Coordinates of C-alpha atoms in Angstrom, one line a residue:
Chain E
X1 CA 0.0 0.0 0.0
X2 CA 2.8 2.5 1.3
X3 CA 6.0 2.4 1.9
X4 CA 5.9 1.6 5.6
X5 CA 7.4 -1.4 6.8
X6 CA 4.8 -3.3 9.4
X7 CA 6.8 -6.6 10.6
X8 CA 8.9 -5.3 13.5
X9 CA 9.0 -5.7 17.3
X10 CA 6.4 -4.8 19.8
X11 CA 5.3 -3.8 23.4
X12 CA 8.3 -5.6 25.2
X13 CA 10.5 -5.1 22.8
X14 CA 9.7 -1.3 22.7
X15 CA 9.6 -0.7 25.9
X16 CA 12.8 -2.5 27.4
X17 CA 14.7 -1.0 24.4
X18 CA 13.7 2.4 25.6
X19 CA 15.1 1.4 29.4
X20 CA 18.1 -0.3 28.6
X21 CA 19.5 2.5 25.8
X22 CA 18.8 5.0 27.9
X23 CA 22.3 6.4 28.9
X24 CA 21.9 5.7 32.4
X25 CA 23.1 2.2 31.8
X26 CA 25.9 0.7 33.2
X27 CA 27.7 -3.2 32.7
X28 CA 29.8 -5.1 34.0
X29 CA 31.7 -7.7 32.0
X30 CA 29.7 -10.3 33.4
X31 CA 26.6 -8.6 32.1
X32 CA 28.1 -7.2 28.6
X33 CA 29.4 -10.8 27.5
X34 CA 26.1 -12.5 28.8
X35 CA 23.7 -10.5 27.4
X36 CA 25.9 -10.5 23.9
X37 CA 26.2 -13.9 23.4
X38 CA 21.9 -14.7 24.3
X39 CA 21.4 -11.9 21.5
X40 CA 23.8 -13.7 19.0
X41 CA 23.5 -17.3 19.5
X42 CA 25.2 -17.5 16.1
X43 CA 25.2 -21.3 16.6
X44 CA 21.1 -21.7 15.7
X45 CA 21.9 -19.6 12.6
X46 CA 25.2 -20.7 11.9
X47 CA 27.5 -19.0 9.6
X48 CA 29.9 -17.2 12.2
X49 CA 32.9 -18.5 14.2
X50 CA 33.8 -16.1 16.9
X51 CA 32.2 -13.2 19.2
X52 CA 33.9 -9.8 18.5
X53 CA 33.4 -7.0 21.2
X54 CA 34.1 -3.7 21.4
X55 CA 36.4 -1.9 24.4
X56 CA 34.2 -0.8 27.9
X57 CA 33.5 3.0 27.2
X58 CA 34.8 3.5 30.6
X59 CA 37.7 1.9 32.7
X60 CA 38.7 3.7 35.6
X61 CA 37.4 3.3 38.6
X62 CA 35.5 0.3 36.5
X63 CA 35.2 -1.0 33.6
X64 CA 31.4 -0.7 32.6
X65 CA 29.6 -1.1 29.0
X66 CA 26.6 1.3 28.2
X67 CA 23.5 -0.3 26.4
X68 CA 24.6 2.3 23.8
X69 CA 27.9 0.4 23.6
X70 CA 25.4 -2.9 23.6
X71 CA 23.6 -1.8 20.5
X72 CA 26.6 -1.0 18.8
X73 CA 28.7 -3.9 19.5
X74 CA 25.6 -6.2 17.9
X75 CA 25.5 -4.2 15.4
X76 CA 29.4 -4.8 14.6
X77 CA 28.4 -8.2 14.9
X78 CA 25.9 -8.9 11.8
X79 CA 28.3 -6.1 9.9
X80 CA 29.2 -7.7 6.4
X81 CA 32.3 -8.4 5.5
X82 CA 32.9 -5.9 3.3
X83 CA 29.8 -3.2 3.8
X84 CA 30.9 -0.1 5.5
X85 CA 29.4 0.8 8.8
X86 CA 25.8 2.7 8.9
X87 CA 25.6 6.4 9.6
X88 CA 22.3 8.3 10.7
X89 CA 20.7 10.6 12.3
X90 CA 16.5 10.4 12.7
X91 CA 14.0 11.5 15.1
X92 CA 13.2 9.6 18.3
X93 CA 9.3 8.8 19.0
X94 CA 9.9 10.1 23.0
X95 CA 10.3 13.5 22.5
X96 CA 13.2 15.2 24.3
X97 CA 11.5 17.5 26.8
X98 CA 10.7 14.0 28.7
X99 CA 14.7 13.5 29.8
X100 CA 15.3 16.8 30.4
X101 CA 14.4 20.7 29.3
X102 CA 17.2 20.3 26.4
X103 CA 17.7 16.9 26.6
X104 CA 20.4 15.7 24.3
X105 CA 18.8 12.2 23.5
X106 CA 16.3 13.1 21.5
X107 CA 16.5 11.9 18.4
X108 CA 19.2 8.6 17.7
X109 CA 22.5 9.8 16.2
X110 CA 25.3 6.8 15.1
X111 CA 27.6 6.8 12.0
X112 CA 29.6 3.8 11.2
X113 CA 27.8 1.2 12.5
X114 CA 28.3 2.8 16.7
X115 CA 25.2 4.2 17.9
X116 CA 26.3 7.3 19.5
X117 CA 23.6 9.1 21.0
X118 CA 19.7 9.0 21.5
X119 CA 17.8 6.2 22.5
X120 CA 16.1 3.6 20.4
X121 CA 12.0 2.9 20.3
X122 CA 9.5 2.1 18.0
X123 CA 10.2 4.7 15.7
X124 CA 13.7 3.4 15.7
X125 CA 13.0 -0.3 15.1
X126 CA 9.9 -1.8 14.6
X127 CA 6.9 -1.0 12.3
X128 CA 8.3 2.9 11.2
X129 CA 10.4 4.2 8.4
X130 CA 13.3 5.6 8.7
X131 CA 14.2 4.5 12.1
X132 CA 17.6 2.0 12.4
X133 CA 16.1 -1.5 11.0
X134 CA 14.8 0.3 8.0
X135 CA 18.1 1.5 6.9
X136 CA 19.6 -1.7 8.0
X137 CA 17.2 -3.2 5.4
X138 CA 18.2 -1.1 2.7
X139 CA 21.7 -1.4 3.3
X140 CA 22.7 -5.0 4.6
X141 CA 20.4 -6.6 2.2
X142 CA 17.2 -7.8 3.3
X143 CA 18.6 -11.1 4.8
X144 CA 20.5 -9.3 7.1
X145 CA 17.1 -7.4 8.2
Chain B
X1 CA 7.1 -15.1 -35.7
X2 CA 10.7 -14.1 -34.8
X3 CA 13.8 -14.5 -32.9
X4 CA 15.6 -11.0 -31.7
X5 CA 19.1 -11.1 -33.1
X6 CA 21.4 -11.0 -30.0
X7 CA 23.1 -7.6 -31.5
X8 CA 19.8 -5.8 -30.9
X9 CA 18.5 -6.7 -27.2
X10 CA 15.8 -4.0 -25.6
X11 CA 15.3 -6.1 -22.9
X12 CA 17.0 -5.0 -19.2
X13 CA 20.6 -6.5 -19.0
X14 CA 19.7 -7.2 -15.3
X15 CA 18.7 -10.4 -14.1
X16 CA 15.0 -10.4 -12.8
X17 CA 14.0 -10.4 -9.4
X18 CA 11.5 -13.4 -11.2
X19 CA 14.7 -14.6 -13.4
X20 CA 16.8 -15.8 -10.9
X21 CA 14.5 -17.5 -8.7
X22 CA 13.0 -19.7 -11.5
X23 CA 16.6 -20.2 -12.8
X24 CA 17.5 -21.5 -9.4
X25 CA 14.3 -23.3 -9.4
X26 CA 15.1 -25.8 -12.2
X27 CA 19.2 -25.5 -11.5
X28 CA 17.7 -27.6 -8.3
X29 CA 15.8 -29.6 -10.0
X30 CA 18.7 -30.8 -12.7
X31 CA 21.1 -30.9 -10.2
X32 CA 18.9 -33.2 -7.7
X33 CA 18.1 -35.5 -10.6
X34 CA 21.6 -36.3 -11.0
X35 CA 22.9 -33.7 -13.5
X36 CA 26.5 -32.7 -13.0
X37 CA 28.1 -30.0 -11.4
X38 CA 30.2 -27.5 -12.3
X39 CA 31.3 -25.9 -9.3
X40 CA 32.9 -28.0 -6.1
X41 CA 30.8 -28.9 -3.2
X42 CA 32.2 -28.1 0.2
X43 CA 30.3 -30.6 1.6
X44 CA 26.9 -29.3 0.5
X45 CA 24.5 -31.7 0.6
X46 CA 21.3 -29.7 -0.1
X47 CA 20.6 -30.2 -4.2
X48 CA 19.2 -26.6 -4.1
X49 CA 21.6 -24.2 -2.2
X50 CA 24.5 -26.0 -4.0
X51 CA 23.1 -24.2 -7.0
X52 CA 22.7 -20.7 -5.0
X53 CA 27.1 -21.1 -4.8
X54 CA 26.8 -21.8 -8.8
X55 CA 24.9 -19.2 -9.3
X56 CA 27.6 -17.3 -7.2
X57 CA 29.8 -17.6 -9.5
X58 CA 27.7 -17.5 -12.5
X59 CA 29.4 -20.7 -13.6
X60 CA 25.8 -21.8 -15.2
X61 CA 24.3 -23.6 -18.1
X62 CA 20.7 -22.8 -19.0
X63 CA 20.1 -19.4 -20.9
X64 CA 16.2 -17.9 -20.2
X65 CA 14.4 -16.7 -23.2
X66 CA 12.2 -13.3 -22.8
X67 CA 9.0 -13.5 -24.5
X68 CA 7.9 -10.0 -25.9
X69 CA 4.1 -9.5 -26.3
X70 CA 4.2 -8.7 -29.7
X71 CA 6.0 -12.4 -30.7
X72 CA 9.7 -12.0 -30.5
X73 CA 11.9 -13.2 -27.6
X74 CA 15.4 -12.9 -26.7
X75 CA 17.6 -15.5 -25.3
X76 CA 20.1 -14.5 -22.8
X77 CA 22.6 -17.3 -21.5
X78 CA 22.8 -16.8 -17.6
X79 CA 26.6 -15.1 -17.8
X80 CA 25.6 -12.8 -20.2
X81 CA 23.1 -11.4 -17.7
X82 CA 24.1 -9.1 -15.0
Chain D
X1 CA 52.8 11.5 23.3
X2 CA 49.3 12.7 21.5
X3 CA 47.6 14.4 23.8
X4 CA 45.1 17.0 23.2
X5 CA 43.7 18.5 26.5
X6 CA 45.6 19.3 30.0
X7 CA 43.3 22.5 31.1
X8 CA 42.4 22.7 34.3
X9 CA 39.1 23.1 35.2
X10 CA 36.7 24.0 37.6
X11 CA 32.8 22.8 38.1
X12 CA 30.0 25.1 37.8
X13 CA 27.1 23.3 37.9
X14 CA 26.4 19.5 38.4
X15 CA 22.8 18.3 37.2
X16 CA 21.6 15.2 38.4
X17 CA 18.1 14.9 36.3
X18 CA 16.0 11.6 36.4
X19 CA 19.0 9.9 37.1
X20 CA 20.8 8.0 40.2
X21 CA 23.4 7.6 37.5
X22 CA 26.0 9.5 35.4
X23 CA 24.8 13.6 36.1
X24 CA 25.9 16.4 33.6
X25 CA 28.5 18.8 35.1
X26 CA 29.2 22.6 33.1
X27 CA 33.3 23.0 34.8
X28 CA 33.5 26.0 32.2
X29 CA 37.5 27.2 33.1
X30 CA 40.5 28.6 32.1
X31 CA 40.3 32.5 31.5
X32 CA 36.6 31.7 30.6
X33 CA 38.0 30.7 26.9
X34 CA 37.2 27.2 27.8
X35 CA 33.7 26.1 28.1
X36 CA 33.3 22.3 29.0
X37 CA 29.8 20.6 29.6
X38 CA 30.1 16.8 29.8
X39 CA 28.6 13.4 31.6
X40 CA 30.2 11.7 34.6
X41 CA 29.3 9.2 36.5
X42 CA 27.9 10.7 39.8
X43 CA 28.1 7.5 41.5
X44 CA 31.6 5.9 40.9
X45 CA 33.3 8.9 40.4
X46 CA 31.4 11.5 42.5
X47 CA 32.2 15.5 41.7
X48 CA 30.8 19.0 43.6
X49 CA 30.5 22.2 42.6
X50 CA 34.1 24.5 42.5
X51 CA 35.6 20.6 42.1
X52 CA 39.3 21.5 40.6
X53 CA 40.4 19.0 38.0
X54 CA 43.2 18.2 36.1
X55 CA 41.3 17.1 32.2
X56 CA 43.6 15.2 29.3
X57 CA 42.1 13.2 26.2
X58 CA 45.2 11.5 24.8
X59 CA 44.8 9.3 21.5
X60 CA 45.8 6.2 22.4
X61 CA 45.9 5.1 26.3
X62 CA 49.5 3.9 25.9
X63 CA 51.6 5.2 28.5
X64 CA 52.6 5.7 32.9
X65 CA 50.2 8.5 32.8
X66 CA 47.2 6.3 33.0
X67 CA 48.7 4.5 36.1
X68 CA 50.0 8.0 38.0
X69 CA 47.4 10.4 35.9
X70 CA 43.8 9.7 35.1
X71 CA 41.7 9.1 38.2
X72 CA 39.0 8.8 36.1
X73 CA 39.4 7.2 32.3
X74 CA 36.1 7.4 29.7
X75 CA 36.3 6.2 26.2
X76 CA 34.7 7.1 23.0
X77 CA 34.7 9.0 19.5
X78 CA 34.2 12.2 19.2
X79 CA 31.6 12.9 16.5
X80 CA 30.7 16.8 15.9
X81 CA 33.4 19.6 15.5
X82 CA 32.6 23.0 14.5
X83 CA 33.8 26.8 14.5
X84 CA 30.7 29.2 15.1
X85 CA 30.7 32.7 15.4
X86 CA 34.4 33.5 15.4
X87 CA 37.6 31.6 15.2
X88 CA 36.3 29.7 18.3
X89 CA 35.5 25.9 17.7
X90 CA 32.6 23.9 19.8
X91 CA 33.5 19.6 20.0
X92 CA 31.2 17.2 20.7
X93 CA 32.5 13.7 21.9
X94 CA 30.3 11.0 22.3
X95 CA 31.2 8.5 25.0
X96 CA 28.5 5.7 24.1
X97 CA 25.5 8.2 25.0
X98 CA 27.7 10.1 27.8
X99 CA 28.3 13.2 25.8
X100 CA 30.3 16.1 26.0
X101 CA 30.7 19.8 24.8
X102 CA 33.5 21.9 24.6
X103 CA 34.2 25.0 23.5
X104 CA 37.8 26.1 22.9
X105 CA 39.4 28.9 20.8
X106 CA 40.3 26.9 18.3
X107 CA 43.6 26.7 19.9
X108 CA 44.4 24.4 22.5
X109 CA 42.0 22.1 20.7
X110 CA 42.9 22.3 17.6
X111 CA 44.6 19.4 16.9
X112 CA 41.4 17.3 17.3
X113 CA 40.3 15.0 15.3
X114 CA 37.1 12.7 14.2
X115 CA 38.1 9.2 16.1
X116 CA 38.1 8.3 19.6
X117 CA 39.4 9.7 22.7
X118 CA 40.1 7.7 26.1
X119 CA 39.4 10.5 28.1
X120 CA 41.4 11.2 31.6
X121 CA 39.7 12.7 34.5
X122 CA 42.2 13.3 37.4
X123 CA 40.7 15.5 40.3
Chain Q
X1 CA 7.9 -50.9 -23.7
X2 CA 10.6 -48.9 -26.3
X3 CA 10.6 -45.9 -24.3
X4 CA 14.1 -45.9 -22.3
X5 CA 13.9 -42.6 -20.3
X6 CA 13.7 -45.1 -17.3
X7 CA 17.0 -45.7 -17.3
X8 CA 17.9 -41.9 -15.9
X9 CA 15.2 -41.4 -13.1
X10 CA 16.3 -42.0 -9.8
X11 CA 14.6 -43.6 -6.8
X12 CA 12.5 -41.2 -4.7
X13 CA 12.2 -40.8 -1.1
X14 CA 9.9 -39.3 0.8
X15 CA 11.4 -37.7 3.3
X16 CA 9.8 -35.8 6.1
X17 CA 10.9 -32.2 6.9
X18 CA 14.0 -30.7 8.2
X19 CA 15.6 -27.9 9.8
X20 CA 15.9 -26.0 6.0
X21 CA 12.6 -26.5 4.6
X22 CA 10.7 -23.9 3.0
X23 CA 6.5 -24.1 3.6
X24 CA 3.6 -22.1 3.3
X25 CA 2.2 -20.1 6.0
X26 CA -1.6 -18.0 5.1
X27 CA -4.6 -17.0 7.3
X28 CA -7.9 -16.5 6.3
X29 CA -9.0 -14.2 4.7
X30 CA -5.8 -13.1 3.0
X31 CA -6.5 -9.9 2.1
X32 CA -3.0 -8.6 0.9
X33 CA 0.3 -10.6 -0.1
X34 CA 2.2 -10.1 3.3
X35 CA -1.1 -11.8 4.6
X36 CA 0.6 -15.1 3.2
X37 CA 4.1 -15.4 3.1
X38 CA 6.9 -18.9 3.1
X39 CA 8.7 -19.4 6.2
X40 CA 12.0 -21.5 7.0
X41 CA 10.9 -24.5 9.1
X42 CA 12.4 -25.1 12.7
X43 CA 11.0 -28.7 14.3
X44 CA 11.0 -28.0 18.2
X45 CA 10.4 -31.3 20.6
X46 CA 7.4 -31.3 23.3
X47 CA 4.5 -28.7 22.3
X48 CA 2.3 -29.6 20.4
Chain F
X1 CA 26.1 -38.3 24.8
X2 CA 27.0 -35.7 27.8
X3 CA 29.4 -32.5 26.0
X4 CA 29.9 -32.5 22.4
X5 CA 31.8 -29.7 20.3
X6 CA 29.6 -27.9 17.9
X7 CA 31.3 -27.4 14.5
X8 CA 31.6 -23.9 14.7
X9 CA 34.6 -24.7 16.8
X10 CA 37.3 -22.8 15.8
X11 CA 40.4 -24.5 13.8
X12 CA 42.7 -23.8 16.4
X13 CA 40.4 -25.1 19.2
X14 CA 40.6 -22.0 20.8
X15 CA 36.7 -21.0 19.8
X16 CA 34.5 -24.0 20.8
X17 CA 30.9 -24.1 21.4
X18 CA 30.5 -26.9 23.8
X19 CA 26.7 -28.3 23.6
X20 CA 25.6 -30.2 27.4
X21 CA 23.0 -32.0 27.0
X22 CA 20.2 -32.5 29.6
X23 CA 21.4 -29.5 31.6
X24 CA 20.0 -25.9 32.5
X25 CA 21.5 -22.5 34.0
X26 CA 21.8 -25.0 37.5
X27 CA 25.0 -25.7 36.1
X28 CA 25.1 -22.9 33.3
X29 CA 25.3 -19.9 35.4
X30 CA 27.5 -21.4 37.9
X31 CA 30.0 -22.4 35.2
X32 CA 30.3 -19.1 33.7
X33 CA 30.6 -17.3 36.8
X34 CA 33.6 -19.8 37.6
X35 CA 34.9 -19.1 33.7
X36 CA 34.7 -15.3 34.1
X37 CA 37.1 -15.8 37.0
X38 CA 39.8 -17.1 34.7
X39 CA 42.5 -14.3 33.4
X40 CA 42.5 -16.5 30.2
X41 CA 39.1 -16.4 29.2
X42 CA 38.1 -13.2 26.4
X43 CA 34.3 -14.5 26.6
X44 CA 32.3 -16.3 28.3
X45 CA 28.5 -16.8 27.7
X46 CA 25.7 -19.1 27.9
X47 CA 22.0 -19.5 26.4
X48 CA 19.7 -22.1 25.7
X49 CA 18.3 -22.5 22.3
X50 CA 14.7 -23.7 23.7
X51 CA 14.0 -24.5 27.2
X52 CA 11.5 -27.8 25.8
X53 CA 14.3 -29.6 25.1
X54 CA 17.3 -29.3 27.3
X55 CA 20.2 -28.3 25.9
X56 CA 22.4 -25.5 26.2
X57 CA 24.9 -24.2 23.7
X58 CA 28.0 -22.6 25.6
X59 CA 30.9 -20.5 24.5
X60 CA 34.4 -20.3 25.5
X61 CA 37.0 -18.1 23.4
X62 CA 40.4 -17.4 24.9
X63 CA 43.9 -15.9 24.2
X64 CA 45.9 -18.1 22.0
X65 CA 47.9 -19.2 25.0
X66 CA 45.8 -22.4 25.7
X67 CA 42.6 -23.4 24.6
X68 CA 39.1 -24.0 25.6
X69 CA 39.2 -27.9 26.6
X70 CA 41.9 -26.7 29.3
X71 CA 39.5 -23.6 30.0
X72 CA 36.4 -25.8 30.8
X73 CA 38.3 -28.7 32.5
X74 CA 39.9 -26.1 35.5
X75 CA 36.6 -24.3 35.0
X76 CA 34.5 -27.6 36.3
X77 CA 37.4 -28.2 38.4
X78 CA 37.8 -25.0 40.5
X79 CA 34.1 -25.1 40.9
X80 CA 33.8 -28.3 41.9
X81 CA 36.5 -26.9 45.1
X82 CA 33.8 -24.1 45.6
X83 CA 31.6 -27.0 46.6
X84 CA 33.8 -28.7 48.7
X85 CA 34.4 -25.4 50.5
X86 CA 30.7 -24.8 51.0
X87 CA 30.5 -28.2 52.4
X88 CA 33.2 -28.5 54.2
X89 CA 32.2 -25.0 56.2
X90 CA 28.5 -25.6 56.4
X91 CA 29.3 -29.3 58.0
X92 CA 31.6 -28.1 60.1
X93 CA 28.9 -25.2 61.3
X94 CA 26.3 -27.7 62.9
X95 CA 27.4 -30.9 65.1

């Protein structure tokens, strides 16, 4: 009918992306490689030999991994072999004001395949255009989708 | 009726989003009734993917013919295509 | 050696909204020609208002100055750097959501680039 | 009879399905194509 | 059959994917948290691929220096001590 893609995730998926990316997040190692590996579990789909991470975004006093981080590092993850990293900027469905007066989230900002800032909801993935899966469609190939 | 000379060819150079999956249909099909293979398994042992890593390569027999409504058709081999 | 900060700053206002976590701080110092605005976490590494500081993004993380230096080490790329109304530039490094703006004279921050950072608090 | 085309066919199994098989999946009433689309086949043990 | 490599092991052994069969996080969770206390270990992480059948996929990927067999064997082994410590303190806690 139109352009908008309607296969995508839902209430839960929605609403605990909207938690964990917000920047307030914090992870251990434990945490970071747990939660990586029950994302990927490459083996059901095959096709891949090792986990790949990327560096905690802080170190001292602790090493902790953001959620941000989390979404980037799968998103390294399903990168193809030879298909440069995404870059985009688009509008959140939260508006700003609900953060902060000025809040810098607002809308998701990420180039190269590392999201950056702004948090992720169902604008961002699930049944909207433009958001992250939508671009991820175009450019990965659908497969990848 | 007529068959296009292949000098003069209208029809898109781009292989169909129809062409290749009927092409891969009956690649399949040959291949699972014993045809052979031109490209080396590694390990395959699905008849049908086996010709999705021919096709990879665009190592393949079977040219497609494009019908044109008015009566003419072209025939494009498969490595001719895009 | 690569580094591309060592001011010494000051806090001016520490904010603390919706969040237990990581708070914004504005520790705008220097003679006033060095405006910095950035994330920390409030809870690991606690800061207060008129907190001096001792500030260094290196490139790479390689050297005895993490072990002495650095109380407090952050990682990320910056993303955004621009030169607005004067020869004065504005950066914007992301830290995996925990941001950060400065705003230098285009000196003392002008050899920054477009990758990442490995930022060095020390108090 | 003089008709030796048999000599090329193969034997045929029936096999029952697998972990790559491709089959239909629909719902009534299919209004628009996405309302019936093919789906890779997963066989899980237990439900039923 | 108990633990059996999955063959997306790595050709150097050093990424592995043991499978344990007829097992759950009971021993899952445990294990990892022993793994994640080895210096060697670059990941560590478990899942389940469905909870009807029970089965869960693990991953062990280390430094080149030794590889995951080793890993899991001192894993098991160091937190098989943990038991016997626990035991050992509890018993001795009560008459």
């Amino acid at each position: 009918t139109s352009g908008d893609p309607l296969r995508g995730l839902i209430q839960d998926h929605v609403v605990m992306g909207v938690w964990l990316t917000c920047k307030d997040t914090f992870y251990t190692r434990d945490e970071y490689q747990q939660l990586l590996f029950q994302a990927l579990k490459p083996d059901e789909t095959g096709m891949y030999g090792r986990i790949k991470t990327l560096p905690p975004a802080i170190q001292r006093p602790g090493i902790y991994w953001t959620g941000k981080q989390i979404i980037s590092s799968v998103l390294l993850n399903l990168k193809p072999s030879d298909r440069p990293g995404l870059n985009l900027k688009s509008k959140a469905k939260v508006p700003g004001k609900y953060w902060s007066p000025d809040s810098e989230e607002g809308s998701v900002l990420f180039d190269d395949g590392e999201l950056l800032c702004g948090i992720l909801d169902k604008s961002s993935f699930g049944a909207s255009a433009f958001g992250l899966v939508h671009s991820v469609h175009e450019l990965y190939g659908p497969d990848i989708a | 009726g007529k068959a296009v000379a292949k000098e003069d060819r209208t029809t898109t150079p781009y292989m169909t989003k129809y062409e290749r999956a009927r092409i891969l249909g009956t690649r399949a099909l040959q291949i699972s009734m014993n045809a052979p293979v031109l490209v080396d398994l590694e390990g395959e042992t699905d008849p049908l993917q086996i010709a999705m890593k021919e096709l990879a390569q665009k190592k393949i027999p079977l040219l497609v013919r494009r019908y044109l409504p008015d009566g003419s058709y072209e025939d494009w081999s498969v490595a001719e295509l895009i | 050696e690569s580094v591309l900060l060592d001011e010494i700053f000051t806090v001016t206002s520490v904010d603390k909204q919706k969040y237990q976590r990581v708070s914004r701080i504005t520790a705008v110092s220097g003679q006033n020609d060095m405006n910095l605005t950035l994330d920390i976490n409030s809870q690991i590494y606690p800061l207060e208002k008129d907190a001096t500081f001792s500030l260094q993004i290196t490139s790479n993380l390689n050297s005895p100055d993490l072990k002495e230096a650095a109380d407090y080490i952050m990682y990320g790329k910056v993303y955004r750097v621009e030169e607005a109304k004067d020869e004065k530039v504005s950066v914007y490094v992301s830290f995996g959501g925990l941001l950060m703006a400065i705003e230098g004279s285009h000196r003392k921050l002008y050899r920054l680039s477009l990758d990442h950072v490995y930022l060095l608090l020390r108090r | 009879y003089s008709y030796s085309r048999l000599i090329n066919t193969n034997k045929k199994v029936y096999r029952h399905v697998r972990n790559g098989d491709m089959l239909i999946l629909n719902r009534q009433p299919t209004l628009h194509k996405p309302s019936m689309m093919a789906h890779k086949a997963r066989i899980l043990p237990g439900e039923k | 059959e108990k633990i059996i490599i999955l063959p997306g092991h790595s050709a150097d052994l050093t990424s592995v994917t043991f499978q344990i069969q007829k097992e759950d996080h009971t021993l899952g969770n445990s294990l990892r948290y022993v793994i994640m206390k080895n210096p060697e270990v670059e990941f560590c992480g478990y899942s389940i691929p469905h909870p009807s059948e029970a089965k869960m996929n693990f991953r062990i990927q280390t430094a080149p220096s030794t590889t995951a067999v080793d890993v899991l064997r001192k894993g098991l082994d160091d937190l098989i001590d943990l038991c016997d410590a626990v035991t050992e303190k509890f018993t001795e806690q009560l008459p």
